[PDB]
Amino acid sequence: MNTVPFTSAPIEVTIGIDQYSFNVKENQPFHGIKDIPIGHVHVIHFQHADNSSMRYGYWFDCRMGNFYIQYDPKDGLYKMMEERDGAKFENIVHNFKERQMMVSYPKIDEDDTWYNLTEFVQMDKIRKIVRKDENQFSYVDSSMTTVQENELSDPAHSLNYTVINFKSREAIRPGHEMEDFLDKSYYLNTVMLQGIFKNSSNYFGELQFAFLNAMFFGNYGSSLQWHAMIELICSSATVPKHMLDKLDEILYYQIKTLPEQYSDILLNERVWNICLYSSFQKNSLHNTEKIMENKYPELL
Template sequence: MDPQHGGSANSSTSSSSESVRPLPSIDISPPPRLRPHQQASADSPSLNSLKSVDSVPVTGIYPLGSLRINEPTDNEDVDMDLATPLTVPDTTPERTMDKNLELLKGGDVLLLDDLPSSFTVGCDTISFSTTQQFLGFRDIPPGAHLIWVAPSESTSSRSGYWITTPTKEETSPGKVYVKQWDKFNEVLSDPASQAEERFQRERLGEIFANLAPYQFKASTSAVSPPSRSGNAEPLPPFVNNTTIWHQLTSSIQSHLLNRVLGGNEETWPVNTTDRIVGETTMPEEARLYPSAAAQFQFSFPMDQRLFDTTAEGSERTQQALDPTTWTLARTDDGKTLLGEIQFAFLTGMHLGNYSCLQQWWYYLVHIVFRSYRLAIERPELALDLVQTFHAQLVYNDRYLEGDIMESMPGEARRLQKALTVYKSRLNEQLLSLGDRCTAEQNAVGQAFSALESWLWRFGWDLRGEYVRSGKVMLEDGEMVEAELSDFESEDERGEFAAVVVDVDENGRPTDLVSV
């Protein structure tokens, strides 16, 4: 019988050994091994399909392709049965590190990983829109710097980081900071893992030429927009285009950022939705920004009285009218107050953080320009405060879109009143000193005069020539008696003013009516 039709191959020998039947042969050889260079059969998945996204199940919190395989650093024997052996680059970690150190001699580097194209990027005094993936900045000089990003220029939410670069010797290399765009939360954050951060640092030599220098001026940059002031007079030296950022950040140090933002880090995240600790959030805002967390902790809370609660009598009244003593008691050398004013202004203006802007107004209206004796007792600190406020106004006018005075008119009106009183008190104190007025104290008066000249462009007259009571003509021509309450604290009719009464020989008030 044909073996192909079920017949036995040993039927011809069955007569000689009918009692013994051969056992069926069993093939126990291993299946053929599919090597990388062999052709796969039609029934098995092809090599191309194994690389397909659709055929590879992925689990985890990181997107496919974001994880990378690092080569082993030791001399282990790796058993890989490949047709073509791997080629190892002729480099060592030590040589890569030495090359990176050479690149960092120009300053610090900040790398932005996974930042999409068409983003708005800002670094200190510059901001620009990207047309392709932006990799970061290089040659960052010593000082405090604010780097932020936003999906577009019209986006209301921005995310950034403060970094502080210490002054180094000429031979000392800079540092490399790595930040990654979190697509899920839409914020700038630290890298997802230490391996990812190390990978970005090691590829510095490959991308260094594509990093933007710190002095980068893009064609689409918002640097030096047309000034609203028109033909303005020349600026003082401390607010020119070269030194203005240093004037704005001179007291922002790492220890101040650690205290205001918490923690002990090398970089400090800030966002548009950050709030001050203890600040009440509206329910609508809580639903809109569920992840917003209160983190700012300023040294001078807005809900705190500006005097010592244990003080009594005239001392309590004096502290309430002039919080100089209270202010100096809460700051070591004055740098705390100055640094927080600088931080609140820049974070509020660049990121649109409303809490920081409110804190900035509070500092100016209730502390800086109400501490009248500061110009006499601590003229160096008073000079720094006046010049910093002047620099902030110039920066707003020349580098930022929008006017902080127009955006918050109620606060601007209160500030104008505070400055009017401050000018009057400052002139009185300096004139009373006469020949005893020091150069530092006189410098405060000159700095305030320069500030007063700048404020004329807002139509602010700080000469203090105002009438507290008198006749006022209404729109229809009628004359009425009126009394202005704008400066009622100046004639000691405030909340903490002492009440003067006449008493008789027994110490009893004589103006009381008795029956």
């Protein structure tokens, strides 16, 4: 179990760690988060009390380094940093644990939610979507645009998700126009899986990462990407059987975790009604269809 210490908490802020959150008052004696489970990526995220504008946060993996948080009063935000001096970091953390100034990552032992939301998410792949190679951790916020969004404007601050566009030459073989538009199996299996992602794990990882950025930061372009990657699978007549069963599990836990009052903005009516009721895979998502019908019947 690993620890992310906080220098201090100089402004009032709601702090999130994965699906957990807590409120910290102005200058409250908060010095970080302990007992973070090893083996998964994590995201620490922030919403200031005074300006709920700009949710922002950091994806990180405690296996890759010792990371801490420090408020910057010039740039006005909590920044993640890496400590290169190991004995300094241990002496800092140990002092903070002794004075009990840290919250405990509050994982229930039965509970596999975070694993199921991040099963295919790797730090190495996050760092290629979010390019800032001098850090081991990745910053994301509410306003960052995706490469595809910037085609339709600052490149360094972009989410480089894989561009998916159903009316594009990449998606449509010359002479297979109708076939490829109405059955996207070519585009899914050859262009994207064999060509770009290499395997279904990397595809699902990007899909899961897009969802988490949509949910935790309200990132609109991440939501577009998540829905596009669902739709590409559901609109393919030919999908490996293991991918369909895994997809049902992936979506089930995403829909299960979504705050009930954010569905109006985070869920695209057309995509879900097409995916669940009209597409080739209308019958392949039993778990997702059951939870969607019992939890968001209005959208449908």
